[PDB]
Design an enzyme around this catalytic site. Structure first.
Site, PDB file in Angstrom:
ATOM      1  N   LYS A 103       0.332   3.428  -3.076  1.00  0.00           N
ATOM      2  CA  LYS A 103      -0.778   4.359  -3.250  1.00  0.00           C
ATOM      3  C   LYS A 103      -0.267   5.788  -3.466  1.00  0.00           C
ATOM      4  O   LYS A 103      -0.983   6.631  -4.006  1.00  0.00           O
ATOM      5  CB  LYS A 103      -1.736   4.276  -2.055  1.00  0.00           C
ATOM      6  CG  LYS A 103      -2.549   2.972  -2.070  1.00  0.00           C
ATOM      7  CD  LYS A 103      -3.624   2.903  -0.996  1.00  0.00           C
ATOM      8  CE  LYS A 103      -4.470   1.630  -1.148  1.00  0.00           C
ATOM      9  NZ  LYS A 103      -3.671   0.389  -0.916  1.00  0.00           N
ATOM     10  N   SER A 146       0.799  -1.224   0.000  1.00  0.00           N
ATOM     11  CA  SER A 146       0.000   0.000   0.000  1.00  0.00           C
ATOM     12  C   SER A 146       0.835   1.279   0.000  1.00  0.00           C
ATOM     13  O   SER A 146       0.259   2.356  -0.186  1.00  0.00           O
ATOM     14  CB  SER A 146      -0.966   0.012   1.188  1.00  0.00           C
ATOM     15  OG  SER A 146      -1.979  -0.984   1.045  1.00  0.00           O
ATOM     16  N   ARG A 169       4.661  -0.606  13.393  1.00  0.00           N
ATOM     17  CA  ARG A 169       5.258   0.164  12.306  1.00  0.00           C
ATOM     18  C   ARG A 169       5.445   1.623  12.702  1.00  0.00           C
ATOM     19  O   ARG A 169       6.554   2.165  12.624  1.00  0.00           O
ATOM     20  CB  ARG A 169       4.385   0.069  11.055  1.00  0.00           C
ATOM     21  CG  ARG A 169       4.239  -1.337  10.481  1.00  0.00           C
ATOM     22  CD  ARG A 169       3.217  -1.371   9.351  1.00  0.00           C
ATOM     23  NE  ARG A 169       1.880  -1.003   9.820  1.00  0.00           N
ATOM     24  CZ  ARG A 169       0.794  -0.953   9.050  1.00  0.00           C
ATOM     25  NH1 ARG A 169       0.870  -1.257   7.760  1.00  0.00           N
ATOM     26  NH2 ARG A 169      -0.374  -0.601   9.575  1.00  0.00           N
ATOM     27  N   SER A 211      -6.371   2.881   3.381  1.00  0.00           N
ATOM     28  CA  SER A 211      -5.675   1.965   2.472  1.00  0.00           C
ATOM     29  C   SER A 211      -6.664   1.108   1.687  1.00  0.00           C
ATOM     30  O   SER A 211      -6.593  -0.123   1.679  1.00  0.00           O
ATOM     31  CB  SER A 211      -4.685   1.082   3.235  1.00  0.00           C
ATOM     32  OG  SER A 211      -3.674   1.855   3.847  1.00  0.00           O
TER      33      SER A 211
HETATM   34  O1  LIG Z   1      -2.887  -1.006   8.639  1.00  0.00           O
HETATM   35  C1  LIG Z   1      -3.798  -0.481   7.956  1.00  0.00           C
HETATM   36  O2  LIG Z   1      -3.963   0.755   7.820  1.00  0.00           O
HETATM   37  C2  LIG Z   1      -4.760  -1.403   7.252  1.00  0.00           C
HETATM   38  C3  LIG Z   1      -5.751  -0.897   6.419  1.00  0.00           C
HETATM   39  C4  LIG Z   1      -6.621  -1.757   5.772  1.00  0.00           C
HETATM   40  C5  LIG Z   1      -6.515  -3.125   5.954  1.00  0.00           C
HETATM   41  C6  LIG Z   1      -5.538  -3.655   6.794  1.00  0.00           C
HETATM   42  C7  LIG Z   1      -5.464  -5.120   7.059  1.00  0.00           C
HETATM   43  C8  LIG Z   1      -5.396  -5.592   8.370  1.00  0.00           C
HETATM   44  C9  LIG Z   1      -5.393  -6.948   8.638  1.00  0.00           C
HETATM   45  C10 LIG Z   1      -5.453  -7.858   7.609  1.00  0.00           C
HETATM   46  C11 LIG Z   1      -5.508  -7.426   6.297  1.00  0.00           C
HETATM   47  C12 LIG Z   1      -5.508  -6.075   6.052  1.00  0.00           C
HETATM   48  F1  LIG Z   1      -5.545  -5.662   4.764  1.00  0.00           F
HETATM   49  C13 LIG Z   1      -4.662  -2.779   7.429  1.00  0.00           C
END
Ligand SMILES: O=C(O)c1cccc(-c2ccccc2F)c1
Length: 242
Positions: free
Chosen positions: A50, A47, A227, A95
């Site tokens: 993006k 991501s 993170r 995201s």
């Molecule tokens: O950390 C984030 O901002 C985020 C945003 C959207 C989805 C996810 C996510 C979290 C757990 C499993 C799969 C995933 F795509 C994380």
């Protein structure tokens, strides 16, 4: 120009993890990292892609501005915040992969490849499906390469319009207070080993800017909050933020 401080590995190993943080002092033109090798190892951007994807969509007119509404396609997904309408700001914040997959389809393979080369972005390789190559295709980028790309964006030096770059930097806004501003983007790569998390961006101060790019091992989603937390703890240790 570059200094390695292996003692910073403790920020990761104390959480039973491994990773790299790369910092760049813009005023002094000096870089710092805990691991020069991993700083130059190339991973899926996930991501964090993006950022370039937004820039390309805006400059080609695929996205008119940061207010345009991208309607939910009515398909229930397992991320609740994705099951709603979005604009560029909220799509970045949450995201929202399916919105950016549609961006990529409208951009198309030819224009996407051309623009990533113009950006000098990573290995510039879009091999794979046009609507998922940043998640499971051939594109790769290192932490140091993220810094190089972000510095161009900060200075409006990428080969897109100034307007497109200003809009994306607005959409990257993550935190702001009386002491600093952070513009950044998270990433989470699970489809190709090794699974990792990303955080890339910069910290604006009154009289300097510090660019940063980090990735870390991410065997499960339980560690995603590390993170930002680890990065900010490094910044505090180095007296970049209070
Ligand atoms: O950390 C984030 O901002 C985020 C945003 C959207 C989805 C996810 C996510 C979290 C757990 C499993 C799969 C995933 F795509 C994380």
């Amino acid at each position: 120009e570059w200094q390695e401080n292996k003692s910073w590995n403790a920020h990761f190993t104390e959480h039973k993890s491994q990773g790299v943080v790369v910092l760049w002092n813009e005023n002094k033109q000096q870089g710092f990292t805990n691991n020069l090798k991993r700083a130059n190892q190339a991973f899926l951007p996930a991501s964090t892609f993006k950022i370039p994807n937004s820039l390309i969509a805006l400059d080609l007119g695929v996205v008119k501005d940061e207010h345009q509404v991208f309607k939910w396609d009515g398909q229930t997904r397992d991320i609740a915040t994705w099951n709603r309408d979005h604009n560029l700001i909220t799509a970045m914040k949450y995201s929202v992969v399916p919105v950016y997959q549609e961006f990529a389809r409208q951009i198309g393979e030819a224009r996407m490849s051309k623009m990533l080369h113009a950006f000098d972005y990573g290995n510039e390789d879009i091999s794979g499906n046009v609507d998922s190559f940043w998640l499971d295709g051939g594109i790769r980028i290192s932490a140091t390469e993220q810094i190089s790309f972000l510095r161009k964006l900060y200075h409006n030096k990428l080969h897109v319009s100034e307007r497109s770059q200003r809009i994306v930097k607005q959409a990257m806004l993550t935190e702001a207070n009386g002491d600093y501003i952070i513009r950044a983007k998270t990433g989470y790569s699970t489809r190709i080993e090794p699974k990792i998390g990303w955080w890339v961006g910069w910290v604006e101060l009154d009289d300097n800017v510090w660019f940063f790019a980090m990735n870390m091992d991410m065997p499960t989603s339980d560690g995603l909050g590390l993170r930002q937390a680890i990065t900010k703890e490094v910044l505090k240790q180095e007296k970049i933020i209070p």
